[PDB]
Amino acid sequence: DALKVRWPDFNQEAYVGGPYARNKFNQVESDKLRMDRAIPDTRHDQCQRKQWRVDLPATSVVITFHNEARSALLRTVVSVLKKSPPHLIKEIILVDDYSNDPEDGALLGKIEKVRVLRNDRREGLMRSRVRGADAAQAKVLTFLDSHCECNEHWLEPLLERVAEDRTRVVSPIIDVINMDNFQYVGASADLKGGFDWNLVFKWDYMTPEQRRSRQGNPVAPIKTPMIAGGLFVMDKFYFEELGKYDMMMDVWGGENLEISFRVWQCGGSLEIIPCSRVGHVFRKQHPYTFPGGSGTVFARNTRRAAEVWMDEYKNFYYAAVPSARNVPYGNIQSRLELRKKLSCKPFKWYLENVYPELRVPDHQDIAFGALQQGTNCLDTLGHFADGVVGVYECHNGNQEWALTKEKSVKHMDLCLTVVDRAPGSLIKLQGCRENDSRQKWEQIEGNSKLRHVGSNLCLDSRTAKSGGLSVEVCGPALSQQWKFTLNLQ
């Protein structure tokens, strides 16, 4: 009481008083804002006129960080204090993950509710959050980054879900805070988290069912196959019972793959609650804002996740990302045991029941995915009947093909056919025929091109503007370069 103070009385000027380098976002602009700057109510009209049960269990807010911009950190803390019912916030625990300046977190202990923990050494987000979860005294946990901003009644909608079902790991729609001007922008409420075989976050359109349910309830919560960020609410016992976080992961990976697989495969579920909104400052090429991400992944954490939950399906990930096979990922022994103990379901269960919309190749396919040449993708051009095939610039995806065990390159039941084998002859998309020789292809030169079996003809673009892909005599030309997204070879 004598050592604490209300946030309105907090001296933010002095705090911030003692531009991209230090944090990969405009710090100069961050400091211009007041710790309690106002933000737009990005909620759906429906949320506005809604009541929440007063008996919602209080929560402990755990914010973990490593060298964060003071303005951003502070703005996050008061964001919580001001935007949520004081009685639902047992405490705000700040885990200073070994920041160069102890004071960044220290000086905030003066504020009501804020307790701050420090680390002897850099421990990373996974360990720090575990530390926080343990020091927490509430029954429910709320994890947030050191650079977020809570909106109107963001918390109740999340607590409502967990109270109802301890096994629900709920997240708010994550709004965007511009890293250059900190304008607070609203994200969609009609997209789910997903991924491709290279295990990189991807956005998805809602499911038909989900859509109907939205016709009924416009702000209805929706299940999500892949968590989209690091913001979420969860039961403390359930968090521990399920295995907390994989303490052996490192600072780079997407620990989020592992957390999403484990929740789903082990009984729980993941939900996105539209009425809940929390702004987040995304770095340059963050996957949430830049499709495909930056295009670089230090595989450790991705392997750790794949090797523990995907069963035989990890080979697809490895088909899309060979290099990852040669990336060390440490011991996953205790994790495989946690899975054993928890008797979680297999991945095949997950693909079929949680993320069925992810097209999985046939176990006997030789290669699968989009057929790319430079940034262009092989496309039927919508000519699904004895038609000429061509290319469209790929969509970051689009049209998938399969190099089947029988040596065919098909799109459903249509095969690329070598109608005429004289150089320059256009190929055609036709109904696949079991033993038909005009439909047999093989990869050569390290899966960098497609030759027509029993000939010296290769699939070529040269004629694209003259009528479509054709078969030319294999050569150096780059219009003969083709790559499947994943190769099981």
Ligand X SMILES: O=c1ccn([C@@H]2O[C@H](COP(=O)(O)OP(=O)(O)O)[C@@H](O)[C@H]2O)c(=O)[nH]1
CB of 68 to ligand X, least distance (A): 7
CB of 425 to Mn ion, least distance (A): 54
The one of ligand X, Mn ion, none whose footprint includes residue 342, by CB under 5 to 8 A per kind, is none
CB of 8 to Mn ion, least distance (A): 27
Whether residue 145 is annotated as binding a ligand: the answer is yes
255 part of the interface to Mn ion, by CB under 5 A: no
Q: Which is nearer to ligand X, 174 or 402 (CB)?
A: 174
Whether residue 44 is annotated as binding a ligand: the answer is no
CB of 85 to ligand X, least distance (A): 26
Q: Which is nearer to ligand X, 128 or 463 (CB)?
A: 128
Q: Which residues of 2-40 are buried (b: 16+ CB within 10 A; e: fewer)?
A: eeeeebeebebeebbeeeeeebebbbebbbebebbeebe
Q: Which is nearer to Mn ion, 145 or 379 (CB)?
A: 145
Whether residue 214 is annotated as binding a ligand: the answer is no
# chain residues binding Mn ion, by CB under 5 A: 1
The one of Mn ion, ligand X, none whose footprint includes residue 125, by CB under 5 to 8 A per kind, is ligand X
Whether residue 52 is annotated as binding a ligand: the answer is no
Q: Which is nearer to Mn ion, 91 or 145 (CB)?
A: 145
175 part of the interface to Mn ion, by CB under 5 A: no
The binding track of 89-128 with respect to Mn ion, each residue x by CB under 5 A or -, is ----------------------------------------
CB of 128 to ligand X, least distance (A): 4
Cα–Cα distance for residue pair 445/433, rounded to 1 Å: 27
CB of 282 to Mn ion, least distance (A): 7
Distances 212 to 222, 223, 350 between C-alpha atoms, Å: 12, 14, 23
Whether residue 99 is annotated as binding a ligand: the answer is no
The one of Mn ion, ligand X, none whose footprint includes residue 107, by CB under 5 to 8 A per kind, is none
CB of 115 to ligand X, least distance (A): 16
Among 91, 145, 149, 460, binds Mn ion (CB under 5 A): 145
The one of ligand X, Mn ion, none whose footprint includes residue 220, by CB under 5 to 8 A per kind, is none
Q: Which range touches Mn ion (CB under 5 A), out of 139-147, 203-211, 360-368, 457-465?
A: 139-147
CB of 280 to Mn ion, least distance (A): 6
The one of Mn ion, ligand X, none whose footprint includes residue 369, by CB under 5 to 8 A per kind, is none
Q: Which is nearer to Mn ion, 146 or 376 (CB)?
A: 146
Q: Which is nearer to Mn ion, 145 or 460 (CB)?
A: 145
The residue number whose beta carbon is nearest to Mn ion equals 145
Q: Which residues are annotated as a binding site for Mn(2+)?
A: 145, 147, 280
Q: Which residues bind Mn ion (CB under 5 A)?
A: 145
Q: Which residues are annotated as a binding site?
A: 64, 97, 122, 145-147, 252, 280, 283, 286, 288
